[PDB]
Amino acid sequence: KSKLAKPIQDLIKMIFDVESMKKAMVEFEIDLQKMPLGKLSKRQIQSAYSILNEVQQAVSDGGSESQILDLSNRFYTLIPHDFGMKKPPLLSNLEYIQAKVQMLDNLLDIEVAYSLLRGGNEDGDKDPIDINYEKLRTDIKVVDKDSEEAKIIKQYVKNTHAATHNAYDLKVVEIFRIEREGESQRYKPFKQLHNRQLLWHGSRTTNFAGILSQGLRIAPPEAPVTGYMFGKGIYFADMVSKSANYCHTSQADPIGLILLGEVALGNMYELKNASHITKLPKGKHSVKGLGKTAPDPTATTTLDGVEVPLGNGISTGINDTCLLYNEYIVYDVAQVNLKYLLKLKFNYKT
Numbered sequence: 047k048s049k050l051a052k053p054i055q056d057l058i059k060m061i062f063d064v065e066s067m068k069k070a071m072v073e074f075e076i077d078l079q080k081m082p083l084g085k086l087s088k089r090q091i092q093s094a095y096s097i098l099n100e101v102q103q104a105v106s107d108g109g110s111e112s113q114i115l116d117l118s119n120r121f122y123t124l125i126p127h128d129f130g131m132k133k134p135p136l137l138s139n140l141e142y143i144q145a146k147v148q149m150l151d152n153l154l155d156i157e158v159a160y161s162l163l164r165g166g167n168e169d170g171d172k173d174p175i176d177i178n179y180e181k182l183r184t185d186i187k188v189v190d191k192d193s194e195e196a197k198i199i200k201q202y203v204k205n206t207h208a209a210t211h212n213a214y215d216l217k218v219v220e221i222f223r224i225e226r227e228g229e230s231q232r233y234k235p236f237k238q239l240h241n242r243q244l245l246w247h248g249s250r251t252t253n254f255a256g257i258l259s260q261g262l263r264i265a266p267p268e269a270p271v272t273g274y275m276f277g278k279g280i281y282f283a284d285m286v287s288k289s290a291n292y293c294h295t296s297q298a299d300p301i302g303l304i305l306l307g308e309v310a311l312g313n314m315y316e317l318k319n320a321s322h323i324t325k326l327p328k329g330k331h332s333v334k335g336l337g338k339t340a341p342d343p344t345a346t347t348t349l350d351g352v353e354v355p356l357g358n359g360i361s362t363g364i365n366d367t368c369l370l371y372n373e374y375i376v377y378d379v380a381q382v383n384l385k386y387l388l389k390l391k392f393n394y395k396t
């Protein structure tokens with residue numbers, strides 16, 4: 047059958063799980079009877095973003111109440127929703143509009159996964175697992191448990207778990223070394239920058255076929271800048287628990303996936319409060335939201351010339367900021383080089 051190693055086989059199955067894709071859409075309150083997985087279109091999603099962009103403008107700029115109603119009706123007609131025996135809420139407040147922009151970010155990845163899964167299964171000689179694997183265009187290898195890399199990664203997970211994020215425990219089930227096709231070449235010029243760190247990136251399991259085949263992506267130009275704190279960029283953290291919260295796991299579904307990527311930060315543009323940034327000031331390569339807590343600088347190590355902030359959660363002293371923990375944002379897709387994929391087990395405490 048499958049030529050792949052057991053853990054990789056189980057990773058592929060989890061990634062392309064159809065039931066999970068539907069569960070995600072249901073959580074987003076989408077009407078699966080009026081809009082099944084097969085109906086999802088790229089241009090459909092793209093248009094929904096532009097509708098959200100306009101309605102966001104109308105609300106913030108004091109638009110006519112009739113325009114907001116019109117935009118609301120157009121949005122729900124485009125993407126059928128199921129609100130029960132409840133009245134459909136209008137897209138009239140920035141927080142609901144924000145929630146909808148994020149639904150679209152996820153649908154963009156779900157659509158990719160379903161499209162990959164659906165076509166190209168014309169072999170027979172090759173096992174279905176192998177075929178889907180090749181669709182990812184990503185070389186995946188299991189990292190040795192009693193390795194030096196693994197030891198360093200486990201230390202990073204254990205030491206960087208946030209204090210306020212103790213609604214669960216975390217166990218590293220498997221660590222995979224991943225290499226997306228052509229990504230190392232895309233990232234090559236940034237090897238010239240200083241301050242290259244190994245940072246975390248959490249996401250729903252349903253987003254991984256898109257992340258692996260397309261890479262980490264920045265929100266589309268049609269998207270409202272408002273739906274993203276520090277503008278439209280790629281977000282990372284130095285505390286495993288801050289990113290792990292973005293996996294959206296539960297006690298009924300405790301297995302999450304998280305990435306470790308080498309990110310070329312260079313000279314950081316340090317911010318204490320949110321800012322819908324459009325472009326970097328001269329001499330800046332990234333943004334750094336300052337948090338009240340961050341890893342112990344004395345404990346910072348190296349893994350292939352890349353800094354690994356694995357020290358224990360220490361008080362930064364920059365205790366006059368909005369953020370409780372740091373945030374790292376890059377506005378160039380080529381400034382990131384994915385290295386590891388970890389399969390985590392969230393042990394929700396009672």
Ligand SMILES: COc1cccc(-c2nc3c(C(N)=O)cccc3[nH]2)c1
Pocket residue numbers: 148151246247248249273274275281282283288289290292373374
């Ligand atoms: C889920 O949609 C959004 C929208 C805006 C910002 C974000 C957002 N994601 C992260 C992550 C991460 N994903 O690992 C880490 C640190 C800060 C972050 N902010 C997510």
